[PDB]
Symmetry: C3
């Protein structure tokens, strides 16, 4: 159950990091 | 501990999933 | 290992909440 958790958390971290760069690019273009 | 972690991780996966769909829509809009 | 996981999931939860906040703001600014 835990080794399974570590995998998933690791995948989540990568997805969250990608969302972090898309979101920074968006905020910069949108401004306001 | 572990059941707690599994509930949390499931909930994150669905939230990341939702973030990913909103951000794809926003990139398409802002990117025109 | 479980305690490092718990902190990893805690940090992800915080990050997901902030991204949800920013994406909601951006949606409002971009419109429909
Ligand atoms: C949890 O991730 C987990 C559960 C059961 C086992 N069983 C093995 C490999 O014996 C591993 C990991
Ligand atoms: C940027 O979006 C970015 C760059 C590298 C990674 N790394 C992995 C392993 O996904 C994530 C996000
Ligand atoms: C983990 O979330 C966890 C830890 C302990 C228990 N209950 C018992 C009886 O150990 C449930 C869940
Ligand atoms: C998001 O990936 C998502 C949500 C719903 C569906 N399909 C239906 C029938 O709801 C596909 C994909
Ligand atoms: C896993 O996160 C983990 C395992 C052991 C310890 N602490 C000691 C003293 O072994 C911390 C964290």
């Amino acid at each position: 159950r835990v080794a399974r958790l570590e995998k998933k958390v690791s995948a989540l971290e990568k997805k969250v990091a990608g969302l972090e760069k898309e979101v920074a690019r968006l905020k910069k273009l949108v401004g306001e």
